[PDB]
Amino acid sequence: MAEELVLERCDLELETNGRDHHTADLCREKLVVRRGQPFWLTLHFEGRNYEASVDSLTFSVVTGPAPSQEAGTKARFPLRDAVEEGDWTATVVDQQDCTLSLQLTTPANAPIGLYRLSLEASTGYQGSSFVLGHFILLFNAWCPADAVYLDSEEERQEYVLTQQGFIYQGSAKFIKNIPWNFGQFEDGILDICLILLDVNPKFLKNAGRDCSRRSSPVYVGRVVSGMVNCNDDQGVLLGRWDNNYGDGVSPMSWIGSVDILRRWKNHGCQRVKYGQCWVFAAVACTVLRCLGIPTRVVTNYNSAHDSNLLIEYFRNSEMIWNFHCWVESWMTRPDLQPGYEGWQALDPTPGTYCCGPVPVRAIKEGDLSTKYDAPFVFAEVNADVVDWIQKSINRSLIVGLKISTKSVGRDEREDITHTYKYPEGSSEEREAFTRANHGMAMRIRVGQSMNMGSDFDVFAHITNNTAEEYVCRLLLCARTVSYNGILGPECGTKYLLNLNLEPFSEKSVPLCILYEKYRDCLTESNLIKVRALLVEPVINSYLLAERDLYLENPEIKIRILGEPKQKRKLVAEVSLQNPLPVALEGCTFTVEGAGLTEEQKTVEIPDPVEAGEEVKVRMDLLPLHMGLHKLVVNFESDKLKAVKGFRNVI
C-alpha cells in the first residue's frame, strides 16, 4: 500500500560541515568536505517520512568525465546502520517528523575533486533516482588514515589553514622576510585549482585515469608542480629576469597568489606576467594548501666570492643564483621504500613535470635514485669545487646556506638547513656524498716549448681514472696576467658543451694560443694564465685547473772566435734569431765584460730584420788574465727590448 517518497529538499549543513571539516571559508555557497571523515546531510520530505521497514535508499557518487567503480571515481552505497570502516557509507543519525539526518563517510584514499551526489528511493515495488547536489572532496591532514596526515594541530593550522606567511629573499647574510597572501580560501581559488587539474597534460592524455589518480598527494603534488610553470600556454606563470617587466606586472610587485590565479583564468588560462622562483613556489603553495596538502615555501641561499672562472663561466637554466625558492609538502610515500614519509620537495620553477616530489631525507642521504628528480634537488644545495695549480678544496662558491621557512604559528624564520645537509666534514655528510656521486683529475699541459712570437697549443689534460663514464662541460681559456696581479683581455677560448670521458681513459684537449691574439695585449711579464673549468652538471661538482705560462725571449748565441791561451787574440760572435713574423726595426747590440774588454762595444744595425732572418755582429776582444771570465750581451729593438745573454770563457 505504501507510496514512494518525494524529496522536498536536501540541506547540505554548510555550517557544521565547514566547522568539522575545517573548510568554513570554502562553505559559503557550496559543500566542501575533507576525505576520511563523516559529514552531514538532512533530507526534508514532502509527506510520509523514511521508514526503514518500507523504503530502501541507495546513493551514487561520480567524479570526473569518465567515472568507473574500479577506478574509485564512482561508488554506490546503501542507507543502513552497519557502517564499514574506510568505505563509502550512509547511515541515519536523526529522524524527526519530516526530516532524516544522514551521515556520509568517504575513504581516506578517495580521489579528491568535484562529485555529483544522486539518491535512489525504492519503496516496495518501485523506485526513483535523482540528483541531490554536489560536494567537493579535499585532502584531510586531520584524518589518521589519510596519506597527508599530520599529527600536530599547530602544524595543520600553519601548513594548511593559515593564508599568510613569509617568503624569504635577499642573501645569506642579509635575509629579508617578505609577507605573502596565499589566500587559498578566497572566492574562486578552489574552483580555479580544480580547473588547473582538469587542464593538466595527464588529464588530456587520459581523463578517467587522471581523476582516479588524484587520490595520491604524490600524484597531485607532481601535477600541481609542472603546471605553475608549464612550457605550454596552459601554465600559470611566465618567468622573466631582465628588469624588463613593462609588458605586465613585476615579480617583486606581487604580494599574493590570488590575483595571479584569477588573471590566469580570467584570460583563458594564459601565462600571467611575470614570475620568479618565489612567485612560482607561493602559487604552488596556495594551490597545494587549497587542496589540503600541508605545504610551505622555502628559500635556499648561495654565495659566490672572487672574476673567478666559475663567475666567468656564468657571467657569460640549471645555473647558480643568489637564492632559489621551492615548496615542500607533507605526505607518506608508499610508492617508495619505507621511511620516506614526511616532507617532499617540489620545484615549480623551470615528464615535463619537474621537479618532484622527492623526500627531503633522500637528498640529505644522497639516495639520488629516489623518485622524483632527486639529482635536480641535490644540485640545488650541493656543489663540490676543487682546485689544482702545481686537490685543494675551493670556497669561492658556497651552495646550501640558511635554507629557511616560516616557523609554525609565529612571525619568525626557521632554519631548516639540517634537513637537507649533514654537518660539513661529518661521517654522514661524506657517507651520503658517496651514495650520491658513486679518480677524476685534470691539469694544464704545453708539451713542446713556447717562444714569444710563435703560436702554440695548450692542453686540458683530463684523466678519468675511475670506471664511470662522465658527461662534462669544459671551458678552457687564456688571458694575459701581470707581474703585479692584473688580468688582461682574452687570447684564446674554447667551450665544449658535450665532453664524454669513456671509462679508464684520458683526453688532452687543445686550445691554440695565437701571436695575433696575445702579442698586442701582453705586458713585460710575457705571462699567459691558462685556466680550465670542468663541470659535471648532474652532481654539480667542479674541477678547476690553472697554470701560468712564460713566453721566453730568443736566445743570444755567443761563440769564441780565437784561442783560449792566457795571452791575446780573441773575437766575439753574437747572434740572435728573430722569432716574430714581422719587421724587427732599429736593432742594436751591446757587449761588455771585464777581463775580455774594457770598451763596451755598441754596434748599430741599419738593416731592418725580418721574420726568421737572424742577425750576426762581431767584436774584437783583448783578454788579459787567465781565470774564468764571462762576456755579457744585451739586445734592443723597436718592438723587442732587453733580451740578455752571456757566455763563459776559460
Binding site: 620568479q276 618565489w278 643564483w321 643568489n322 637564492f323
Partner: peptide, 5 residues
Amino acid sequence: PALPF
C-alpha cells in the same frame, strides 16, 4: 630579484 652569479 632572483639574481644569476
